[PDB]
Amino acid sequence: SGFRKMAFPSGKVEGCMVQVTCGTTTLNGLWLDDVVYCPRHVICTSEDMLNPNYEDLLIRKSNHNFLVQAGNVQLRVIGHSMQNCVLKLKVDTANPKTPKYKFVRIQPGQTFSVLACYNGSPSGVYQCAMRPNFTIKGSFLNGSCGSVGFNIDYDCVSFCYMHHMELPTGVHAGTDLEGNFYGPFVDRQTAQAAGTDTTITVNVLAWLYAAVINGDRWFLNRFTTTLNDFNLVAMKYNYEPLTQDHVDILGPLSAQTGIAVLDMCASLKELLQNGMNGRTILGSALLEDEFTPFDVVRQCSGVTFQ
Amino acid sequence: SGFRKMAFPSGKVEGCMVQVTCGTTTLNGLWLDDVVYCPRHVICTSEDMLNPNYEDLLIRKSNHNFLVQAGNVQLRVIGHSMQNCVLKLKVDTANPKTPKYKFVRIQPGQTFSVLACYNGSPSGVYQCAMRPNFTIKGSFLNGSCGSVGFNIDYDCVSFCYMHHMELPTGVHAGTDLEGNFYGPFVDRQTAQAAGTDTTITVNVLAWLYAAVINGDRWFLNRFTTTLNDFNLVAMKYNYEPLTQDHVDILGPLSAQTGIAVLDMCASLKELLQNGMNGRTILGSALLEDEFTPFDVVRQCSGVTFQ
């Protein structure tokens, strides 16, 4: 028992991280088969980052202008292309450590692990949620661009995030591995509105079920509610509306705990209206929304990976 | 910027995890060079776990009674010995993935990453602190024994924890890699008092400095304090006494932020006496004590590992 914010084991991804240098900019790239993926703003100087014409800036570059280093070894770049906001550098060597992998575009509310990297070397790993407003609340310093977020299903790594920038508000923005930004952000240093962020209701309920499984249960009450009534409260507290799809994915947890989803919503309603009165749930004094229902079942059932 | 509970990259440790079977018990072992380390209670049946005589129970076992599996390959056991509460199985093959490593006994308040494993396969990674009472607040299910906690310094893995059991209170207990339990616990299924746990004061202060570095600063006040006065309050709130050694290790953070350690204690004093008034610090509504001062500098400076 016990419940922790648990990241995937990072070994499969560690073997894919390389360092990419262009001019005086160095950041991280992802080496899969014979292609290295990295943020296209690697080709930018500081004077270019206001309103960069990436097409024009990439034209001034040739294969030999991109230095790719995996550990202490050189890769040789034999082709380069831009896909949306990512650069794809073809190298002459397939990565011998390439895992089975897929590129996925995650939906808001879904979670993933982030391997924070500097100079092509792993620094640490943590679990993140894609916020409803398509930012992530990460931990990234200068040099971390090109760090990736991922999920693992047995032996297959699904890459879903590449880190591109920090907004002036201190939150983070990036792309999928096809180079499409999550949200409305662009890779230029301008003012960018993140937009109102809400709480991922289905994830809070998942965590409340996790709490019950683990012995934290003072918050269970003698009330129930309806989808519509609960959604009235959700709107008041800037929670995402609950749908029957969300109820359906909470099914397995309701079966495990014997607590109907709408009864757990009624507990959540009272917690929203009355607070926690200075108590805690799973070691937290606020409502946690970065565990999906799959995350809770995964952790509480001990699923492993190759 | 941003501050997250960050675990070490787990790849070096992933390559050391094996499955160990004895009788009908299967758990995790750590394969370093030609030795596999695992909890000695692998040799126990359920009827033995009340008052096991491990010496007598190990006498009934020979090398061929221990099945060690690394992935899908067999290791052959050519020697077995008991060191305190760990079994050391000599195998005929040195682990080709053995990292540079050391065995360390950590002190209370120090942190480490835990690679939770089942059947010799990694399930996830999270950051833990050794509580002052020598328990850890982990996430462990049946099958997780032999999962290990570790730190990494560049290319060297310092193993500090092997998971052995869950106490009836739901917290976790285990040994260093020489098999000495942390705390007063024993590997038998009996009643075991954890003892009063306190908050790791120096870690809370480290996190408050982390908050300031990251823009969370409403809690800075116009007061100061003295070691003795602050320690009066610490005692009242079940915080560990602050010593000049603790002040000294907070030096680098005070220099970075320009906030004297005793001024930060005065902020902590007011937070202890007045609470947070429904506000948050680094996304938390309670005072966090699982970041050491080194952890904060490590995360805020982007230290990497080979």
Ligand SMILES: *C(=O)c1cc(-c2cccc3[nH]ncc23)cc(OC)c1OCC(=O)N(C)C
């Ligand atoms: C990419 O590595 C990168 C990183 C930053 C940056 C700075 C501070 C915090 C932070 N969090 N995520 C990213 C962060 C800034 C960069 O440039 C200013 C940057 O590299 C891009 C670059 O150097 N140019 C000129 C495009």
Ligand SMILES: *C(=O)c1cc(-c2cccc3[nH]ncc23)cc(OC)c1OCC(=O)N(C)C
């Ligand atoms: C070791 O893998 C192990 C694990 C448990 C156990 C059960 C539930 C939660 C939990 N958290 N950490 C460890 C936990 C219980 C075991 O045996 C009852 C156990 O293996 C030891 C064993 O099977 N015997 C009989 C010694």
